[PDB]
Amino acid sequence: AREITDIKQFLELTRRADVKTATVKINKKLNKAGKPFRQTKFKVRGSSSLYTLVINDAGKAKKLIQSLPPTLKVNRL
Amino acid sequence: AKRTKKVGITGKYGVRYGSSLRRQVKKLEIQQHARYDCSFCGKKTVKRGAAGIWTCSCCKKTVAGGAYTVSTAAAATVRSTIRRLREMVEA
Amino acid sequence: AHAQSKREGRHSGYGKRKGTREARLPSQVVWIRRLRVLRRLLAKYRDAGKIDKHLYHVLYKES
Amino acid sequence: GRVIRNQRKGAGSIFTSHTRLRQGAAKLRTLDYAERHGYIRGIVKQIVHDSGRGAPLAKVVFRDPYKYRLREEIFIANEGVHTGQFIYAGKKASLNVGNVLPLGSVPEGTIVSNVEEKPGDRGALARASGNYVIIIGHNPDENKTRVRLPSGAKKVISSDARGVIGVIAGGGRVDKPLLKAGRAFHKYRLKRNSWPKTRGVAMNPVDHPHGGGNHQHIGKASTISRGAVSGQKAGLIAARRTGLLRGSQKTQ
Amino acid sequence: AAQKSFRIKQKMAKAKKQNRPLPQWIRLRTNNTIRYNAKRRNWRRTKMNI
Amino acid sequence: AQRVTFRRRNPYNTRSNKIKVVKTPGGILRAQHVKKLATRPKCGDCGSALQGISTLRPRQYATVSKTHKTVSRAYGGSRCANCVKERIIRAFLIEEQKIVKKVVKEQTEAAK
RNA sequence: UUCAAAUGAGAACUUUGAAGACUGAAGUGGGGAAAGGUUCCACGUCAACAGCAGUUGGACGUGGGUUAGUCGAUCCUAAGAGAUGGGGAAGCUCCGUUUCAAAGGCCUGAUUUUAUGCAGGCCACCAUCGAAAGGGAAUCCGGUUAAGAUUCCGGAACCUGGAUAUGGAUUCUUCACGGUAACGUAACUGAAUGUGGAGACGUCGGCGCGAGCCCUGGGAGGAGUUAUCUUUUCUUCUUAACAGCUUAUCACCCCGGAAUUGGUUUAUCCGGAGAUGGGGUCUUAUGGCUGGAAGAGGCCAGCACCUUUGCUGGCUCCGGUGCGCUUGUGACGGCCCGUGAAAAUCCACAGGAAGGAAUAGUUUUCAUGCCAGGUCGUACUGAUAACCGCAGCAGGUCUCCAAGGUGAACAGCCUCUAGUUGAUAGAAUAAUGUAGAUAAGGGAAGUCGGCAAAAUAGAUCCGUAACUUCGGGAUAAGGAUUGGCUCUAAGGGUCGGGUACGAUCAACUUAGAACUGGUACGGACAAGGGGAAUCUGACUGUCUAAUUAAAACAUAGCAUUGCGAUGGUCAGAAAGUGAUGUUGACGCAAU
RNA sequence: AUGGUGAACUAUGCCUGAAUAGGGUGAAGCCAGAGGAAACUCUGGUGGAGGCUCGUAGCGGUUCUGACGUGCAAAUCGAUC
Ligand SMILES: [Mg+2]
Ligand SMILES: [Mg+2]
Ligand SMILES: [Mg+2]
Ligand SMILES: [Mg+2]
Ligand SMILES: [Mg+2]
Ligand SMILES: [Mg+2]
Ligand SMILES: [Mg+2]
Ligand SMILES: [Mg+2]
Ligand SMILES: [Mg+2]
Ligand SMILES: [Mg+2]
Ligand SMILES: [Mg+2]
Ligand SMILES: [Mg+2]
Ligand SMILES: [Mg+2]
Ligand SMILES: [Mg+2]
Ligand SMILES: [Mg+2]
Ligand SMILES: [Mg+2]
Ligand SMILES: [Mg+2]
Ligand SMILES: [Mg+2]
Ligand SMILES: [Mg+2]
Ligand SMILES: [Mg+2]
Ligand SMILES: [Mg+2]
Ligand SMILES: [Mg+2]
Ligand SMILES: [Mg+2]
Ligand SMILES: [Mg+2]
Ligand SMILES: [Mg+2]
Ligand SMILES: [Mg+2]
Ligand SMILES: [Mg+2]
Ligand SMILES: [Mg+2]
Ligand SMILES: [Mg+2]
Ligand SMILES: [Mg+2]
Ligand SMILES: [Mg+2]
Ligand SMILES: [Mg+2]
Ligand SMILES: [Mg+2]
Ligand SMILES: [Mg+2]
Ligand SMILES: [Mg+2]
Ligand SMILES: [Mg+2]
Ligand SMILES: [Mg+2]
Ligand SMILES: [Mg+2]
Ligand SMILES: [Mg+2]
Ligand SMILES: [Mg+2]
Ligand SMILES: [Mg+2]
Ligand SMILES: [Mg+2]
Ligand SMILES: [Mg+2]
Ligand SMILES: [Mg+2]
Ligand SMILES: [Mg+2]
Ligand SMILES: [Mg+2]
Ligand SMILES: [Mg+2]
Ligand SMILES: [Mg+2]
Ligand SMILES: [Mg+2]
Ligand SMILES: [Mg+2]
Ligand SMILES: [Mg+2]
Ligand SMILES: [Mg+2]
Ligand SMILES: [Mg+2]
Ligand SMILES: [Mg+2]
Ligand SMILES: [Mg+2]
Ligand SMILES: [Mg+2]
Ligand SMILES: [Mg+2]
Ligand SMILES: [Mg+2]
Ligand SMILES: [Mg+2]
Ligand SMILES: [Mg+2]
Ligand SMILES: [Mg+2]
Ligand SMILES: [Mg+2]
Ligand SMILES: [Mg+2]
Ligand SMILES: [Mg+2]
Ligand SMILES: [Mg+2]
Ligand SMILES: [Mg+2]
Ligand SMILES: [Mg+2]
Ligand SMILES: [Mg+2]
Ligand SMILES: [Mg+2]
Ligand SMILES: [Mg+2]
Ligand SMILES: [Mg+2]
Ligand SMILES: [Mg+2]
Ligand SMILES: [Mg+2]
Ligand SMILES: [Mg+2]
Ligand SMILES: [Mg+2]
Ligand SMILES: [Mg+2]
Ligand SMILES: [Mg+2]
Ligand SMILES: [Mg+2]
Ligand SMILES: [Mg+2]
Ligand SMILES: [Mg+2]
Ligand SMILES: [Mg+2]
Ligand SMILES: [Mg+2]
Ligand SMILES: [Mg+2]
Ligand SMILES: [Mg+2]
Ligand SMILES: [Mg+2]
Ligand SMILES: [Mg+2]
Ligand SMILES: [Mg+2]
Ligand SMILES: [Mg+2]
Ligand SMILES: [Mg+2]
Ligand SMILES: [Mg+2]
Ligand SMILES: [Mg+2]
Ligand SMILES: [Mg+2]
Ligand SMILES: [Mg+2]
Ligand SMILES: [Mg+2]
Ligand SMILES: [Mg+2]
Ligand SMILES: [Mg+2]
Ligand SMILES: [Mg+2]
Ligand SMILES: [Mg+2]
Ligand SMILES: [Mg+2]
Ligand SMILES: [Mg+2]
Ligand SMILES: [Mg+2]
Ligand SMILES: [Zn+2]
């Protein structure tokens, strides 16, 4: 239901006591008028609602994924 | 452009009921739908809303009045009578 | 094809008309259209200075 | 034959008053300590139409002498009373339209409304639209007051019996032709089930003293005795005269 | 009646069960005299009256 | 052309059976049932819808934080500000004028 | 209605394919309320039943099938019903419902023998039943079954009760700051008592806006047609509840101080009780973008193979229009001797009893977290066969959704989607019929009587008498015109212009002019006969279900009668009984 | 005669719900204009009134004294209304 846009707040989520499962989706999408680019949505499933963070930059994307808690059971795609 | 030689508001009844009744109705209709002066605030904005009830659009006072007109002759004389009678009681 | 030919004015003579002129397009609809157009031409003239508010105000009630 | 219409009325089945929309009964304040030694003030808070009634009601609210709360009352609005007006009630109240005072405290000529028949009965006399009673005399020993009711009747009641200064609102309601069947329809639709009215002379004998015959006609004097019996009393009951009234009426 | 009381459904169910032919093995009992179910009901020949 | 059906057993068009037509992600038309519209809370003194205050159906107010139910003035969510100017002004002058009446008739009780 | 195939002992009637039609979104479509009760669905299957038949069935036999914290019931109150202290009645029982009654239960404090006795102060509200259309806490989409689904599965929410910790906020000025103000907010203590709001409310009219539908351009796809013609015809291109931000007519605040009166609606209402102007505040209906959410669904292409049935790709985009249609909603306006429910329930405010920090307190109306949500209904029909009429009866029976053309139109007539193509059949076409049409000349001579039938009709223009309550009579009467095609003319929107015009996009309406045809053109459909008088009821309305619709009844209007409550009229066997009466002569009752 | 059972039809009241194509007419209110010495009188608009009117659905049941009259039917069917 919810959407998140503070990269810092997101890492805080991903470590909350109930947050067990999470997922990364990949969307091909077009940029401005010209070409396309690679969007990636980070979805943490907290107990009562599903938070989702859209990182629009393929760069920030990769590095963020490394920071992902090594016990979180991420679903890739 | 004058639309009617004499029925006025009463034209809505067509030919029915008889000219006399339509006359009587005409008089009290004109009375009840009329816009009246508000004693309290001075704008002519008192319109009726069910027999006896007279309310002011602006300012919002409501005054009990006549079935079809804000003040009734009987009411009015009674008012001054009471004026008069009360006058004796302090004097 | 037919709609086209109506856009072109065909099929609209007296022999092709069955509702009253008024049922086809209301007098009142026409009026409101018209009166809105005069009304908002005044407003723009006023708001430009092309007209002075005094002349406007007479024109309004004349309109 | 059959039980006639005016007898069936009394068992009030389909004949009870249509009541659902009514504001509540109209009533003076219960005659407490304030109103019979001093006065107590209220505000008319709303004047309001009451279905089936012709005169508007005044909703008037007072403080409670013995408990912290408002107590609200339903008055019948006298002409000229208005929202936000202060209404004064009690022995020692002052003589203006809208206030309620015991007939003992008002000079003869006073024009009042909703007056009590006995003190405390919270109002009975002259409540219909336009109506009032005039005080036409006092008898300070054995404190009675003598008034003239709207009917013409003069009557003497206790001087503690209360009434409200002025006339009831909605006057002249009856000056205006109903015009059509339909307006009577809605009139009685909010009152009781008395409309329309079949003439007994249009029924068959089973149904009415007037019923039957090969022409329509009453066949006997329609002035019926007081001592007649149920089933018999139709027409001019106890009529002491009859025929078009010539010449001025008005109680001499 | 498309949205029913338990009471009515209960009766309905007791009626469903009673709607079957005679259990043939009965026919073979000593002194048995019942040929056929003489109390069989059908929704389009006889109504339950509830 | 796609038509639609009620979704509760009630077939009648009552105030509690309002319907709104909607396109689903399946790409079909479907009815949705619609709760009655909330009305705005009104002022105790005048009667106007009072500004500042959320409008919900009554039980829906116990689901919503305290600040959807007030403005931060005296008689906040209850009376309509202008109605409270009036209250303050009227209070003051009357309490003042009460001081006035006392000292006036105090003089009447000493000079007569 | 027809051809063929398949199945079967058997085929006009079953199944499948083809063809010809129909219902024509006011449905022969898609669902429901009452009622039925298994009729639903599968398999088997024809003795009876389906007024021919039967391999088929709502039949017969045997089985399967109805899943809920959120949909209903349950709760609330309505007309009304109805216990109880009582009062009548021989009594079955009648009356009364807050009444002539000693009518009861909550909040916490008092206990640290202990479990709950008394200590305050309240509150005197005095049953209960009565709505599956009224009121009302909370759920949506996709998928799935032979037959259930807002109920299962997937995913995403929300409400109510109960538990509670962590963060945040608050406090040394203890119970927040900010804004002149309308008021802002992530929070920001609040008992008794009081008060306010919501729940909560007629009808019609135009206007404004939303939604879905309808019309339509570009593009990316699939289909159809192609002797000829058509950059063509048909079709797919979708986005739920919920959540973040945003968004409004109305209303309101600050500045200001108005005659040359201004502002202003289609509809004439507003201003020194402060307009117009400028600048702000608020409701969040509704819409926007994003989250949900492309992973779904929709449409294609390319390989795989008895199989479960897969696998892999793509594309699912950008716009236009309006007195359109339906529905919703707002700001207004008309109307009344009519002014158009109640209760449960939820919130707010006034109040300030009380409780509470600095060596550390207060806070669950802020966030996040944990647990639980019982009981009954849920299948299907809803009607020219599942209900009621003895029946599979041309009858009756409450309701929501509603496409294109023509046209004023939810009319008639043709059509798309969906659904039907069921109603014994074959061969002939005598009389007499029923139902549908036409007739030369005459034109009511027929007949009790123009009964029946015929005639008239749409729209635009022209023209319209007696009489009249001046509103009508009136479409009075009487006339002309009306197709096709091809042109001209008039009626609009949006923009930048120092402090006269230009440029652009999008709509049928109306009028006039040519041309043209076997003089036809409201070309089918649709659609008033008119006039002069007499009798009679004023009118609209009403009745003899099933031989009388009328001049009968009603009505408004007129007039008469009774009555001031210790009453008039009327109910009851009686009564501490009842109707009018939530009443009061501008009223109730009776003619 | 005595004691019982019915307002599922229907009559009337009450409570709570629902429903009703498209046209014709053009009442009050309101704007602008014209005449007149004056009193006052006219014209064009706007507006959208009515137990108003044409006419579906609805509700009704007038005529054919039509059909049927061992019926589809113990009251129906058709046209007209
Ligand atoms: Mg007009
Ligand atoms: Mg318009
Ligand atoms: Mg314009
Ligand atoms: Mg003006
Ligand atoms: Mg009663
Ligand atoms: Mg009656
Ligand atoms: Mg009569
Ligand atoms: Mg009479
Ligand atoms: Mg008779
Ligand atoms: Mg007799
Ligand atoms: Mg006699
Ligand atoms: Mg007689
Ligand atoms: Mg007579
Ligand atoms: Mg049956
Ligand atoms: Mg039977
Ligand atoms: Mg359903
Ligand atoms: Mg708010
Ligand atoms: Mg607020
Ligand atoms: Mg405070
Ligand atoms: Mg056949
Ligand atoms: Mg066809
Ligand atoms: Mg067809
Ligand atoms: Mg049709
Ligand atoms: Mg059928
Ligand atoms: Mg069904
Ligand atoms: Mg059944
Ligand atoms: Mg079946
Ligand atoms: Mg057989
Ligand atoms: Mg059978
Ligand atoms: Mg047979
Ligand atoms: Mg056979
Ligand atoms: Mg079976
Ligand atoms: Mg079975
Ligand atoms: Mg619910
Ligand atoms: Mg329950
Ligand atoms: Mg009892
Ligand atoms: Mg109940
Ligand atoms: Mg309910
Ligand atoms: Mg309900
Ligand atoms: Mg589904
Ligand atoms: Mg299953
Ligand atoms: Mg199903
Ligand atoms: Mg689930
Ligand atoms: Mg989940
Ligand atoms: Mg909770
Ligand atoms: Mg703060
Ligand atoms: Mg309250
Ligand atoms: Mg209230
Ligand atoms: Mg209601
Ligand atoms: Mg919802
Ligand atoms: Mg502004
Ligand atoms: Mg400002
Ligand atoms: Mg509708
Ligand atoms: Mg009103
Ligand atoms: Mg509130
Ligand atoms: Mg204490
Ligand atoms: Mg909380
Ligand atoms: Mg179902
Ligand atoms: Mg069927
Ligand atoms: Mg039938
Ligand atoms: Mg069907
Ligand atoms: Mg047959
Ligand atoms: Mg034959
Ligand atoms: Mg001939
Ligand atoms: Mg001739
Ligand atoms: Mg002759
Ligand atoms: Mg002749
Ligand atoms: Mg002859
Ligand atoms: Mg004759
Ligand atoms: Mg003769
Ligand atoms: Mg004829
Ligand atoms: Mg001819
Ligand atoms: Mg004539
Ligand atoms: Mg021509
Ligand atoms: Mg042009
Ligand atoms: Mg142009
Ligand atoms: Mg004669
Ligand atoms: Mg008549
Ligand atoms: Mg009539
Ligand atoms: Mg008859
Ligand atoms: Mg008979
Ligand atoms: Mg008739
Ligand atoms: Mg008849
Ligand atoms: Mg007369
Ligand atoms: Mg007694
Ligand atoms: Mg009944
Ligand atoms: Mg409605
Ligand atoms: Mg209409
Ligand atoms: Mg017409
Ligand atoms: Mg009409
Ligand atoms: Mg002049
Ligand atoms: Mg009209
Ligand atoms: Mg009519
Ligand atoms: Mg008519
Ligand atoms: Mg027509
Ligand atoms: Mg008809
Ligand atoms: Mg009919
Ligand atoms: Mg009728
Ligand atoms: Mg008939
Ligand atoms: Mg006959
Ligand atoms: Mg025969
Ligand atoms: Zn005023």
C-alpha pair distances (Å), B27 with each of B15, B66, B68, D245: 18, 14, 10, 28
C-alpha pair distances (Å), E6 with each of A61, E9, E11, E14, F20: 60, 5, 8, 12, 34
- Give residues with Cβ within 8 angstroms of D206, minimum separation 6: D1, D2
Cα–Cα distance between D169 and D157 in angstroms, integer?
A: 24
D112: chain B residues, CB-CB within 8 Å: none
Q: Where are the alpha helices (DSSP H) in D25-175?
A: 33-37
Cα–Cα distance between D28 and D88 in angstroms, integer?
A: 12
DSSP state of D89: E
Closest to D239 (Cα-Cα) out of D228, D250, D252, D251? D228
Q: Is the dihedral of CA F51, F57, F59, F63 positive or negative?
A: negative
* C42 touches C53 (CB < 8 A): no
DSSP string, D60-76: EEEE-TTSSSEEEEEEE
B71: chain D residues, CB-CB within 8 Å: 79-80
Strand positions, DSSP E, F16-73: 19-23, 29-33
- Cα radius of gyration (chain F): 27
Counting every residue, how long is chain B?
A: 91
**Chain B closest-CA separation from residue D178 CA (Å):** 9
Q: Which of D179, D183, D190 to mutate to test the interface with B (most CBs of B within 10 A)?
A: D179
* E34 touches E27 (CB < 8 A): yes
Strand G close to F46 by CB, under 7 A: no
Closest to D128 (Cα-Cα) out of D178, D80, D87, D169? D169
Helix (H, G, I), strand (E, B) or coil at D157: strand
The verdict on a CB contact (< 8 Å) between D106 and B85 is: yes
* D119 touches D160 (CB < 8 A): yes
* D103 touches D145 (CB < 8 A): yes
Which residues partner with B63 through β-bridges? B54, D82
* Exposure of E12 in the CB half-sphere (CA atoms within 13 A): 9
User: To one decimal place, what's the resolution in Å?
Assistant: 2.9
Amino acid code (one letter) for D199:
R
DSSP state of D155: E
Per DSSP, chain A holds a count of helices (H) and strands (E) of 2, 5
Tokens linked to D2:
């059959």
Strand G close to D130 by CB, under 7 A: yes
Q: Name the packing angle between helices C27-46 and C53-62 (round to 10°).
A: 170
Amino acid code (one letter) for D220:
K
Which residues partner with D163 through β-bridges? D101
Counting every residue, how long is chain C?
A: 63
- Give residues with Cβ within 8 angstroms of D122, minimum separation 6: D27, D28, D29, D30, D31, D116
Nucleotides of strand G under 7 angstroms from a protein beta carbon: 25, 29-39, 58-62, 65, 71-72, 78-80, 123, 132-143, 150, 155-160, 176-179, 181-189, 193-201, 206-208, 211-214, 236-244, 250-253, 260-271, 273, 281-285, 290-298, 323, 327-330, 334-341, 345-350, 365-370, 376-382, 386-388, 391-392, 398-403, 405-409, 416-417, 458-461, 469-472, 481-489, 491-494, 499, 508-512, 521-523, 538-541, 552-557, 559-566, 568-572, 578-591
Phi, psi torsion values for D142, nearest 5 degrees: 45, 70
Counting every residue, how long is chain A?
A: 77
Give the CA-to-C1' distance from C18 to G457 in angstroms.
12
Cα–Cα distance between D160 and D193 in angstroms, integer?
A: 38
Tokens linked to D191:
């009152």
Strand G close to D31 by CB, under 7 A: no
Which residues partner with D164 through β-bridges? D100, D113
Cα–Cα distance between C16 and C24 in angstroms, integer?
A: 12
Cα–Cα distance between D115 and D127 in angstroms, integer?
A: 8
C-alpha pair distances (Å), D15 with each of D6, D11, D185, D187: 11, 8, 15, 15
Tokens linked to C8:
């072109």
Stated as kind and residue range, the H or E segment containing F64 is: none
D47: chain B residues, CB-CB within 8 Å: 53, 62-64
Q: After which residues does chain D become discontinuous at a C–N distance over 2.5 Å?
A: none
Contact D187/B at CB under 8 A = no
- Experimental technique, in short, is X-ray
The verdict on a CB contact (< 8 Å) between B52 and D129 is: yes
In the 3-class helix/strand/coil scheme, how is C4-53 assigned residue by residue?
HHHHCCCCCCHHHCCCCHHHHCCHHHHHHHHHHHHHHHHHHHHCCCCCCH
Give the CA-to-C1' distance from F5 to G17 in angstroms.
35
Q: Are strands D70-76 and D111-113 parallel, antiparallel or unpaired?
A: unpaired
- Give residues with Cβ within 8 angstroms of D107, minimum separation 6: B85, B88, B89, D135
